[PDB]
Ligand binder design. Structure first.
Ligand SMILES: Nc1ncnc2c1ncn2[C@@H]1O[C@H](COP(=O)(O)OP(=O)(O)NP(=O)(O)O)[C@@H](O)[C@H]1O
Ligand SMILES: Nc1ncnc2c1ncn2[C@@H]1O[C@H](COP(=O)(O)OP(=O)(O)NP(=O)(O)O)[C@@H](O)[C@H]1O
Ligand SMILES: [Mg+2]
Ligand SMILES: [Mg+2]
Ligand SMILES: [Zn+2]
Ligand SMILES: [Zn+2]
Lengths: 51, 81, 92, 656, 567, 364
DNA sequence: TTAGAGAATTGGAGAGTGTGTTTTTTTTTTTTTTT
DNA sequence: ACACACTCTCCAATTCTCTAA
């Protein structure tokens, strides 16, 4: 929101002085960018599944 | 505009149902009523939305379905029977 | 509404455990009764409507009234549970 | 654009001010204060308008005309804070004592800046930056008196008063915690190594961002400015709210309130629940920026505090100046203070002398105790009145409510156990949970009066159990888990079961209180209405006289007035008299007899329950209160036997 | 040699050495500069040691690390309400209790730029919160304006966290409620402290402006204030081990420890003993399957008024490292366990985890509120299932309860279970139940009267009930060490006695819980002697204390009433 | 160590009691950093001046410290192709294409000139490198380059390009003429070749080859680098001719030294080898020729601090051996000069002074 | 070889213009009327 | 009307080139 997003207005202290911000203030959030998921919680198909 | 939801018989066990929204134009308005089970043919289409981008923080587009068609007496033989 | 799933939804095709059932409010026992009757859950509020499947088996525990069972009395006399709910357990 | 004439010239008044500061005396009065300011011993100057009035009268009696500066600074008070400050700065004397000047950052900065200018040459800064003091006006004494001396209720403060100096009477509703406010801000320029200042008056400001100094500009040095705390000037700020007394609200209306601001050494003077005479300057609050352009002509307003007068001196505020010493010596030299003070409580009520003596000991109270391992024992005394209808119980109870400097009155039917103790309210619009103390917290370090104690619900009365013995409150509710302090003594009144006392039953049947609560009162007094042609005649003659004259009938006895009574009690609550072995043996032996007699008679019509260990400590507390009233530092056996008599007399009403 | 980066320093040592007597004052008046000076001194000294003593350690490793001083014990503590605008940027010391902590916030420290056309890159230093972005790309042949750009995920960051500290009740003004202040904490100290902790801190008292709106540089005249902590403290030697082992060899140990938890309280020896065993606790057990078994003991004190029950709860509340004191009319079901606010929040039994929860006026709270305790006492867990939140939390919490009987004074014409009046599912969950009675006796009364009156012979008493008691500090050390290092096991002999004793109480009512509570009490007794095995003596003491607590010997075995003459 | 908002403030006092202000926690302890940080705030930079167009990317206008990348099969197949080309085709190709262009030089176009000069260069260098490596290879394979007609033609291209101020052909011709000289020193390290040298070093050509570094100061970083490497070779041949004192004095003057420093200060971009070449030349100017007065000029003294600091040249690269061994001697001789005649303190800022009566004593 | 007279290219000072701003639950403590 | 973002314009500072002593 504090960057130049087309069609939307701006919205513990951040960082400032960057060109695109002008006099505004910028903060950040932490998140995880995953690449795969694995879960850990017909009789013929079942039998083929077993060793 | 009409909101369309997965029929409960189709939804897999232990999952919530999904939703989509459909746009109806000139000849198709009021073809269906709330609570009906309905079948739809149309174009699948997308557009930019500022609020989605602002809330999610990624260049994420929104999607919609534009309907082209929508779907859901007796003879003399029956009367004689 | 927040819609987000409750306990009976997570226990679909599973076992749902209720401990100290007799302490549950009547206003909520009836909700469990309505779900158990149909294996189905219904939502209708704030312009949002939804129907969900709840194929869940229930396992419950309870206290006899007064803390100790009375051999002079029926299980209905001993247990603080309404007759329609009692009618729907396969085994006691 | 246009201009007018007015009757006041400020040059003349400035000359009057500078003469007054250097000439007036009751050396001159204010020069001693300015010497203390110069020595860094004193932080604030309080100007008395009684002095200015006296000065005007003396100058007039010497046969010369003078301007009425007193009305002039009441009519337009804001401007004269600046005039007096400039006069003080002009006339300030040099220090009498060494100071350790190098402790001041501003001194070093300004000395170096002056040296830079001196080298360069081979107003500088705003004067507010070096005013080490605060200044306030104190209103005219009404006994000399003018509007500033006459209190206004919060309804009478019309729009006419904006700008003037006034006095307001009411109750404080809430108080903010202290935070700093800027007055002069300081900056540093990186490239040219030069400092600049900015002064702030409005609620908001824009900080500087370019070095506009002429030398820096002529070197084409477009350097960057940075803010600094270490050479900025702050002042302490606090905001409060005052509201009109409930007994002055006209019928069908909702009470009104005012916003109070406080700066300087006057901070943290006010407290919630105080009844007070605040005096100050009443001003508007202008809008700023784009908001002003579309706010319209309706102005917000507030009161700048200058001085505060409390109605009743709290016991913690006592100190023995010789003015008070001279008055307590009257009572001490006159003698027999116990009887005179007891007789002086509510003189318009006939008889009841032992009840009044018990209530005097309630006002004094025992000694707080704290053992070396961390155990602590209650010092407060709890009292209860149990009796027939129409024997002045509510009247006597409400009379003691006037003497105590902190106290509250409450009735059993109008009260919730929550609101009596403390409540967890979801009060703000933001869904936040906040704790707000009840009546027993507002009565902290005071007396709490509970009338109609027998009408209060059995469940709600249990809330009082913790406060009575442990003097604290414990809460564990949604989002809140804390303990509050409640150092309060309880006084309560009730009718027996079925109303008028029934002699067919035992005292315990009539009393109808549970054992755990009946034990928490140190004294329970039983008073019965039994007819007698002789006593009824005397009471009627006394009451009829009072209705005829508005005065108690007197031939021999003069009561002490409530003010001198408060001074004596406040002095007496400082003594902490200790016990001794000779006294300890006597009370130890008395206690055994009480429990043996109780055991013998638990079956009997004359029973009152069983004597617990809390009855021993009751004797010690009553004995120590008696020792305090005679200003001793040692409990005497003379006190113990009186403390036992006063407990024995409570039961004699049962024997007609 | 331990590979560690932070050095503690109590400031009084600066006054002892003559050359630093003035540096002590300069530290308090100019913390930001002085602390930095100290840091760069320590690092240089560490380098000097390895190069002068010519040791094998990697010089590059030491050059890479950051070293920080952490000063403490600076001076007198300051009341939270009495900080004034003349204290700004000076060092401060505060005492208080921790309410809550926000999650870790990333704080930027170095910015990373890349040229859009020629792919030149620059790392830039952040100071005073402002990014010093270059005007033009610095590569000689690509000297172009607006040509550099920031790359967020190649910057470098650091951890910041905010802690909410509340005023301790010792300082609050008369007739008022406590206030709170916010602490900013960085790097090492980030996750140190939990809700309900009690601490003392040291840090610079700071103030800053705040903006009127997010669009413009307009500031408000009032300034925000906070504390910037540099150290946190909670409110071993062979000599300690020697003292502990020597004390454990005394013959009168069990009585010595018991009479020393609450020195000024007269007699009530069995009550003190039971409370001591609650402090030690049993052993915690977990299986591969078949669950986990609680080590904690629950106690109920029931009886006549004035008997000094609540006074005992004060001592336990101050002795325990973690715990809570509360009242029956003061507690709701939510407040006692956990609160929805969308976020979840902790109640008393959760804050008290691993400690003792003292509940007074237990007979005043309703059946609705008391029903919450069944699950927490039996399982030591709290299950929740409400809108948007469903989970289970751990509660290893010991309950100490106080109540008065029905009718408010013990009635000898009713059986004991009817006087106590708790329902059986809840009364079955206490390990020990005590009856205490206000029985008249001249022998007892003279001693009690002499004891209480002796406290008033002095202004601040030195007098104490007994000649030999242990100081609170050492007693705390003993209990803490024994909890950490000692883990008793059942011996076969103890197994035989427990089976025999249970069959004795059972054959005649004793439930199956009487067996488990006996095991737990015997284990607690074994720890208190620093033994690794439960023996016959421990089992017999556990049995004896259970029989003594509920006045069983004086109980009519058939009618359930107590003969008051036998007390 | 501590975060970006912890920072205090610093004041620094000069002689004459004037004070400056700088922020940040490292400035408290490091004066070198404080002094550098103080000047770094200041806004201005002087704006700056700038040679080649019309032709496809090549060595002439790109930084060639950037390879292109081969499969193993490709590496060996490419090596086989050009190795067989050299052993088979090179002399017969060059002999034909050169005896064409002598008859057609007037009609040429810029591209054909830049092709010829960058085909010559590549193949001669690659063969020298290959026989440096191994004895199976020999130098006879490239020996058509030396015979007299081609030598004249490379000379003539360089001549004509220089006169008309066509700087791209001049650049390529510089590269070709470098290699011919390199090949000559190879063959002398083994008759007609000395004749070819004597004709290559007629006085006219020494005027040209002396002239060439002086103009390099303005142009791109490659041009100056070509000038340096050619100069190194040109002097080294004439060293092993044994005239020499006439020729070396021809090279030593202010506008050559200007080019050398202007090139040397971009050392972050350059090779380990080129700096060896520059300091070889300074050893020649300073120690051997004993023309010390050229290098007492301030922007050299700045440079040696940057490059020698913990900032720049690595603590263990071979460059620091040469640089520190140079600077030690530099400052010793500078000390001696300054104490003998204190006027050089004001000398060190400015160019030397060309007046007859004072200038002779100034330079010595 | 220096230097001075004339022409061309570039920077940014600073002046101008247009613009945006005020402003149905769900969970939990407490009072009140209703069966 | 009050801080900002962006556009437009003119003027002089600068370097380059030619000529003669
Ligand atoms: N000794 C007395 N002297 C003077 N007035 C008295 C006396 N005894 C009773 N009265 C009068 O009795 C009236 C009622 O007093 P009040 O305090 O309301 O009684 P009470 O004890 O509170 N009765 P109740 O509230 O019904 O239990 C007052 O007007 C008193 O003036
Ligand atoms: N054995 C004792 N030792 C010390 N003080 C005692 C003893 N017995 C009684 N007391 C005193 O008597 C009072 C008992 O108060 P308290 O602790 O509230 O007792 P309690 O059992 O909680 N009674 P209650 O609150 O009415 O149920 C305190 O002042 C104690 O100091
Ligand atoms: Mg009354
Ligand atoms: Mg108690
Ligand atoms: Zn400046
Ligand atoms: Zn670039």
């Amino acid at each position: 929101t504090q960057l130049g997003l087309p069609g939307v207005k701006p919205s513990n202290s951040g960082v400032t002085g960057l060109r695109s911000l002008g006099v505004r203030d910028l903060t950040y959030k932490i998140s995880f960018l995953a690449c795969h998921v694995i879960s850990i919680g017909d009789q013929e198909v079942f039998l083929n599944s077993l060793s | 505009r009409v909101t369309l939801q997965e029929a409960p018989g189709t939804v897999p066990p232990g999952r919530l149902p999904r939703h989509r929204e459909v746009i109806l134009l000139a000849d198709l308005v009021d073809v269906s009523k709330p609570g009906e089970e309905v079948e739809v043919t149309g174009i699948y289409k997308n557009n930019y939305d500022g609020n989605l981008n602002a809330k999610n923080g990624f260049p994420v587009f929104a999607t919609i379905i534009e309907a082209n068609s929508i779907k859901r007496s007796w003879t003399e033989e029956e009367e004689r029977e | 509404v927040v819609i987000e799933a409750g306990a009976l939804m997570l226990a679909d095709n599973g076992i749902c455990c209720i401990d100290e059932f007799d302490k549950m409010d009547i206003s909520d026992q009836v909700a469990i009764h309505e779900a158990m009757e149909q294996q189905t859950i219904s939502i209708a509020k704030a312009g949002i409507h939804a129907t969900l499947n709840a194929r869940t088996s229930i396992l419950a525990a309870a206290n006899p009234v007064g803390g100790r069972y009375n051999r002079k009395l029926s299980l209905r006399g001993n247990l603080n549970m309404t007759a329609p709910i009692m009618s729907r357990f396969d085994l006691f | 654009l246009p201009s007018i004439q007015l009757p006041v010239d400020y040059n003349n008044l400035f000359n009057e001010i500078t003469d007054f500061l250097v000439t007036f005396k009751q050396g001159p009065k204010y020069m001693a204060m300015l010497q203390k300011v110069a020595n860094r011993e004193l932080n604030s100057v309080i100007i008395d308008l009684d002095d200015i009035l006296q000065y005007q009268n003396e100058k007039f009696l010497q046969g010369t005309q003078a301007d009425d500066l007193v009305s002039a600074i009441q009519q337009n008070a804001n401007h004269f804070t600046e005039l007096f400050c400039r006069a003080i700065d002009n006339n300030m004397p040099l220090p009498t004592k060494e100071i350790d000047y190098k402790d001041d950052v501003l001194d070093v900065i300004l000395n170096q800046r002056r040296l830079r200018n001196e080298r360069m040459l081979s107003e500088l800064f705003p004067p507010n930056l070096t005013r080490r003091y605060f200044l306030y006006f104190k209103p005219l004494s009404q006994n000399c008196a003018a509007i500033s001396s006459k209190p206004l209720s919060v309804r009478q403060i019309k729009g006419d008063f904006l700008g003037q100096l006034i006095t307001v009477r009411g109750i404080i509703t809430r108080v903010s915690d202290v935070k700093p406010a800027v007055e002069v801000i300081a900056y540093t320029c990186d490239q040219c190594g030069y400092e600049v200042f900015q002064e702030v008056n409005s609620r908001t400001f824009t900080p500087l961002s370019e070095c506009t100094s002429e030398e820096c500009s002529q070197n084409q040095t477009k350097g960057q400015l940075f803010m600094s705390t270490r050479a900025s000037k702050f002042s302490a700020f606090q905001e409060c709210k005052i509201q009109e007394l409930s007994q002055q609200v006209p019928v069908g209306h909702i009470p009104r309130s005012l916003n109070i601001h406080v700066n300087g050494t006057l901070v943290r003077s006010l407290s919630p629940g105080d009844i007070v005479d605040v005096t100050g300057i009443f001003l508007p609050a202008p809008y700023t920026g784009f908001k002003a352009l579309k706010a319209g002509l309706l102005t917000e307003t507030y009161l700048e505090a200058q001085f505060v007068r409390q109605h009743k001196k709290k016991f913690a505020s006592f100190s023995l100046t010789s003015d008070v010493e001279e008055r307590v010596m009257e009572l001490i030299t006159s003698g027999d203070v116990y009887n005179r003070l007891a007789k002086s409580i509510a003189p318009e009520i006939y008889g009841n002398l032992d009840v009044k003596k018990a209530l005097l000991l309630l006002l004094v109270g025992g000694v707080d105790k704290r053992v070396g391992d961390g155990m602590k024992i209650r010092g407060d005394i709890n009292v209860c009145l149990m009796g027939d209808p129409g024997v002045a119980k509510s009247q006597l109870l409400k009379a003691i409510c006037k003497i105590s400097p902190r106290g509250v009155y409450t009735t059993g039917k109008g009260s919730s156990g929550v609101g009596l103790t403390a409540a967890v309210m979801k009060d703000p619009v933001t869904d936040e949970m906040i704790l707000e103390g009840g009546a027993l917290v507002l009565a902290d370090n005071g007396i709490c009066c509970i009338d109609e104690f027998d009408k209060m619900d059995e469940s709600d009365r249990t809330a009082i159990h913790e406060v009575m013995e442990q003097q604290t409150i414990s809460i564990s509710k949604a989002g809140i888990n804390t303990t509050l302090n409640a150092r309060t003594s309880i006084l309560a009144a009730a009718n027996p079961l079925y109303g008028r006392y029934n002699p067919r039953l035992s005292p315990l049947d009539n009393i109808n209180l549970p054992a755990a609560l009946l034990s928490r009162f140190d004294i329970l007094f039983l008073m019965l209405d039994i007819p007698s042609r002789d006593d009824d005649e005397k009471l009627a003659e006394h009451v009829t006289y009072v209705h005829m004259h508005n005065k108690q009938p007197d031939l021999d006895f003069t009561p002490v007035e409530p003010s001198k009574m408060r001074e004596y009690i406040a002095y007496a609550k400082t003594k902490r008299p200790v016990m001794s072995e000779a006294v300890n043996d006597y009370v130890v032996q008395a206690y055994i007899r009480l429990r043996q007699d109780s055991k013998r008679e638990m079956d009997s019509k004359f029973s009152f329950g069983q004597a617990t260990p809390r009855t021993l400590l009751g004797i010690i507390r009553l004995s120590q209160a008696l020792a305090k009233l005679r200003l001793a530092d040692m409990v005497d056996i003379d006190d113990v036997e009186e403390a036992l008599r006063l407990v024995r007399v409570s039961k004699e009403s049962l024997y007609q | 040699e331990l590979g560690t980066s932070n050095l503690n320093l109590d400031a009084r040592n600066l006054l002892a050495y003559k050359q630093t007597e003035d540096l002590y004052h300069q530290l308090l008046n100019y913390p930001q500069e002085v602390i930095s000076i100290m840091d760069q001194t320590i690092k240089d000294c560490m380098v000097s040691l390895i190069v002068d003593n010519n040791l094998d350690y990697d010089l590059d490793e030491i050059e890479t690390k950051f070293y920080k001083v952490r000063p403490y014990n600076v001076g007198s503590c300051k009341g939270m309400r009495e900080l004034n605008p003349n204290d700004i940027d000076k060092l401060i010391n505060l005492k208080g209790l921790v309410l809550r902590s926000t999650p870790v916030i990333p704080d930027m420290k170095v910015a990373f730029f890349k040229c859009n056309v020629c792919d030149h890159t620059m790392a830039v230093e952040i100071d005073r919160g402002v990014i010093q972005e270059p005007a033009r790309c610095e590569r000689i042949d690509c000297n172009e304006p607006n040509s550099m750009s920031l790359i967020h995920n190649r910057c470098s960051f650091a951890d910041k966290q905010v802690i909410k500290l509340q005023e301790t009740p010792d300082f609050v003004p008369d007739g008022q409620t406590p206030h709170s202040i916010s602490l900013c904490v960085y790097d090492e100290l980030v996750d140190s402290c939990r809700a309900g902790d009690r601490i003392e801190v040291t840090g610079t008292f700071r103030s800053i402006p705040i903006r009127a709106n997010s669009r413009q540089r307009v500031l408000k005249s009032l300034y925000k204030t906070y504390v910037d902590v540099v150290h946190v403290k909670k409110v071993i030697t062979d000599q300690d081990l020697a003292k502990i082992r020597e004390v454990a060899a005394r013959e009168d140990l069990y009585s010595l420890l018991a009479r020393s938890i609450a020195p000024s309280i007269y007699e009530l020896e069995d009550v003190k003993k039971g409370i001591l065993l609650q402090l030690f606790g049993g052993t915690n057990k977990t299986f591969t399957k078949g669950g986990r078994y609680r080590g904690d003991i629950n106690i109920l004190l029931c009886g006549d008024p004035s008997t000094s029950k609540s006074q005992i709860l004060q001592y336990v509340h101050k002795i325990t490292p973690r715990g809570v004191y509360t009242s029956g009319k003061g507690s709701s079901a939510v407040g006692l366990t956990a609160y929805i606010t969308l976020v979840l929040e902790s109640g008393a039994l959760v804050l008290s985890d691993g400690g003792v929860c003292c509940i007074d006026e237990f007979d005043k709270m309703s059946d609705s509120t008391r029903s919450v305790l069944h699950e927490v006492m039996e399982q030591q867990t709290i299950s929740i299932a409400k809108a948007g939140i469903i989970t289970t939390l751990n509660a290893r919490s010991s309950i100490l309860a106080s109540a008065n009987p029905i009718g408010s004074r013990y009635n000898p014409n009713l059986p004991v279970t009817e006087n106590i009046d708790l329902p059986p599912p809840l009364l079955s969950r206490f390990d020990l139940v005590y009856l205490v009675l206000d029985k008249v006796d001249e022998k007892n009364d003279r001693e009690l009267a002499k004891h209480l009156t002796n406290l008033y012979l002095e202004d601040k008493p030195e007098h104490i009930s007994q000649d030999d008691v242990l100081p609170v500090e050492f007693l705390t050390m003993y209990i803490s060490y024994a909890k950490e290092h000692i883990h008793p096991i059942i011996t076969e002999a103890a197994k035989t006695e427990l089976v025999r004793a249970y069959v004795g109480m059972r054959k005649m009512t004793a439930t199956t819980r009487q067996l488990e509570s006996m095991i737990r009490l015997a284990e607690a007794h074994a720890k208190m002697k620093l033994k690794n095995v439960v023996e016959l003596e421990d089992v017999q003491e556990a049995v004896r204390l259970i029989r003594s607590a509920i006045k069983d010997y004086a109980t009519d075995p058939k009618t359930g009433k107590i003969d008051m003459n036998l007390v | 160590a501590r975060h970006s908002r912890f920072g205090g403030l610093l004041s620094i006092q000069t002689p004459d009691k004037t004070r400056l202000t700088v922020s940040g926690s490292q400035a408290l302890v490091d004066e070198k950093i404080a002094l550098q940080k103080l000047d770094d705030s200041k806004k201005w930079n002087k704006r700056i001046i700038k040679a080649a167009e019309g032709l496809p990317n090549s060595l002439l206008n790109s930084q060639t410290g950037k390879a292109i990348f081969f499969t193993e099969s490709n590496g060996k197949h490419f090596k086989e192709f050009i190795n067989n080309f050299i052993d088979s085709g090179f002399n017969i190709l060059l002999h034909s294409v050169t005896n064409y262009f002598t008859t057609e030089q007037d009609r040429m176009v810029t591209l054909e000139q830049v092709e010829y000069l960058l085909f010559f260069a590549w193949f001669v260098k690659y063969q020298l490198l290959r026989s440096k490596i191994d004895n199976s290879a020999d130098i006879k394979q490239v020996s058509e380059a030396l015979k007299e007609v081609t030598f004249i033609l490379v000379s003539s291209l360089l001549r004509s390009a220089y006169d008309l101020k066509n700087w791209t052909v001049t650049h390529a011709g510089m590269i070709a003429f470098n290699e011919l000289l390199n090949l000559v020193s190879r063959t002398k390290a083994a008759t007609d070749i000395e004749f070819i040298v004597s004709r290559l070093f007629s006085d006219e050509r020494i005027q040209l080859l002396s002239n060439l570094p002086k103009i390099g100061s303005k142009y791109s970083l490659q041009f100056m680098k070509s000038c340096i490497e050619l100069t190194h070779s040109v002097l080294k041949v004439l060293e092993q001719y044994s005239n020499f004192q006439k020729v070396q004095a021809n090279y030593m003057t202010e506008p050559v030294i200007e080019t050398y420093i202007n090139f040397l200060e971009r050392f972050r971009e350059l090779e380990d080898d080129s700096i060896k070449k520059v300091f070889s030349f300074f050893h020649r100017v300073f120690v051997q020729a004993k023309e010390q007065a050229l290098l007492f000029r301030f922007d050299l003294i700045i440079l040696l601090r940057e490059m020698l600091s913990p900032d720049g040249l690595d603590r263990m690269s071979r460059s620091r051996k040469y640089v520190s061994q140079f600077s030690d001697y530099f400052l010793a001789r500078l000390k001696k000069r300054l104490k003998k005649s204190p006027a050089w303190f004001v000398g060190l800022l400015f160019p030397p002074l060309h007046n007859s009566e004072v200038g002779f004593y100034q330079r010595y």
